[PDB]
């Protein structure tokens, strides 16, 4: 069955805020563990540590976020999982100082997230797959 559209929106925007914080200048790598687990957590966690190691950071402007589809699979006492398909329109700037100019992008892309509810009532993003447009 379908998940509430605003609840998927709030999950994806907390993820996007945490991504901005972890990849940002303050380098809140710990905060990734609030929203991510498993392979997605490992990937973004190594990206955050690499960025902080090379003294680069990221600035974001999230122009549009829209939940295209959202489903929840309450698989009994084994836990629950969910799948969210969202279209992101976002601009970003990598502040690196070993180059004369900072690299920027503006991208509209679809992304599917697979999340799993932990046994504490909280949701955590576990896997993701982009299709860029």
């Amino acid at each position: 069955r379908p998940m509430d559209t605003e609840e998927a929106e709030e999950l994806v925007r907390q993820w996007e805020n945490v991504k901005a914080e972890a990849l940002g200048p303050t380098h809140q790598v710990y905060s990734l563990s609030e929203v991510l687990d498993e392979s997605m957590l490992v990937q973004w966690q190594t990206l955050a540590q690499t960025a902080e190691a090379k003294s680069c950071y990221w600035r974001f402007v999230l122009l549009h976020l829209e939940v295209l589809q959202a489903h929840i699979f309450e698989d009994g006492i084994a836990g629950e999982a969910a799948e969210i398909e969202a279209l992101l329109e976002e601009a970003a700037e990598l502040v690196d100082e070993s180059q004369p100019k900072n690299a920027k992008y503006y991208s509209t892309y679809k992304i599917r997230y697979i999340l799993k509810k932990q046994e504490d009532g909280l949701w955590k993003f576990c896997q993701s797959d982009i299709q860029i447009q």
Binding site: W44, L88, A92, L94
Partner: peptide, 9 residues
């Protein structure tokens, strides 16, 4: 090295 597009997701 790092590329700016690594932060989409």
């Amino acid at each position: 090295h790092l590329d700016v597009m690594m932060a989409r997701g």
